[PDB]
């Protein structure tokens, strides 16, 4: 109403503390990171927790992976996505490509695509949406600005339905541009960066909330690991001293 923007809980351990309450409701959050940083995992965990914890239905739009592979790989975290799909609480929308596709001009694919995303959200009454691998849809149209503001048409339309959306995308360097192809220009409201930094010959995973428009959040990088229960962050700064003592 006349209040500051509210947030929806991800229930991703540590993240709701870093974000001071979760992801801003009814807006898009970009999650950008090099290959294998945990973007797709973040975007699945977001939808899964919504279904399991809050009975909020989800739509997962896949541009890179097949739905069969998304479901099979999620078993790694003890998540049965096939059951949720059967129950109608999750819908996986396949926009990944036939190996057999051909030459194109025009970006209208994508108008039809936005309408299918809308229809799915309404059909499943979804409140959470994940869009996986914006980078991939860019590579299919060669970063022509027909994909670029067809992307803005998507971000806009999601905001109109009031969907709360995670969009994942690739970057090439750990400490360099936010997103390959400048994706952060469109998914611009909120930006989360996942890193997999080389410390000598060892890797350290970190998560940073760079920006959340209209609200507060913790700053800088926070280390995390990926476990059999998904992403697990820890809130060094957020800890508080309330604990009791006795003689």
């Amino acid at each position: 109403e006349h209040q500051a923007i509210a947030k929806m809980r991800t229930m991703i351990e540590g993240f709701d503390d870093i974000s001071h309450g979760g992801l801003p409701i009814g807006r898009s959050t970009l999650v950008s990171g090099t290959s294998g940083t945990g973007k797709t995992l973040f975007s699945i965990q977001f939808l899964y927790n919504g279904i399991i914890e809050f009975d909020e239905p989800g739509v997962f739009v896949t541009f890179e992976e097949t739905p069969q592979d998304i479901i099979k790989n999620a078993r790694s975290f003890g998540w049965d996505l096939a059951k949720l799909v059967d129950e109608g609480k999750l819908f996986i929308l396949d926009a990944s490509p036939d190996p057999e596709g051909q030459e194109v001009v025009g970006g209208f694919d994508l108008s039809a695509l936005i309408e299918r995303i809308n229809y799915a959200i309404q059909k499943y009454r979804a409140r959470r949406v994940s869009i996986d691998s914006v980078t991939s849809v860019f590579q299919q149209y060669d970063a022509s600005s027909v994909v670029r503001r067809e992307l803005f048409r998507l971000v806009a339309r999601l905001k109109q339905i009031g969907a709360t959306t995670v969009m994942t995308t690739e970057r090439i360097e750990e400490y360099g541009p936010i997103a390959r192809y400048g994706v952060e220009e469109f998914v611009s409201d909120n930006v989360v960066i996942l890193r997999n930094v080389l410390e000598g010959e060892r890797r350290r995973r970190t998560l940073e909330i760079l920006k959340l428009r209209g609200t507060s959040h913790m700053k800088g990088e926070y280390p995390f690991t990926i476990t059999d229960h998904g992403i697990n962050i820890f809130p060094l700064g957020a800890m508080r001293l309330t604990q009791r003592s006795s003689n």
Binding site: G106, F108, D109, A112, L113, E115, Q140
Partner: protein, 93 residues
């Protein structure tokens, strides 16, 4: 002549643009008319997904014959029509 169908973004002009080219090329070939039907991706994204038809505009021929998927957001479109004509010639072949 073919249950032929085209998936469009929202009857976007590129789609309609291509559609005319598709219609023009298609009409040219012969008897055994092809049925051209457009499917609004916005209306039913479900079928698009099964076809794994992520991109629009796109064209898909169900039958007769085996099924094929012709796509590409870019307007290859005249070139795509030429390719379709070549396929007809091979169909002619």
């Amino acid at each position: 002549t073919y249950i032929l169908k085209l998936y469009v973004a929202g009857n976007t002009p590129n789609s309609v643009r291509a559609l005319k080219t598709l219609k023009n090329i298609l009409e040219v070939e012969f008897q055994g008319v092809y049925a051209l039907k457009v499917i609004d991706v916005l209306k039913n994204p479900q079928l698009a997904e099964e076809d794994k038809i992520l991109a629009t505009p796109t064209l898909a021929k169900v039958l007769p014959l085996p099924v094929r998927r012709i796509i590409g957001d870019l307007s290859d479109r005249e070139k795509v029509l030429i390719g379709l004509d070549l396929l007809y010639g091979e169909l002619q072949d």
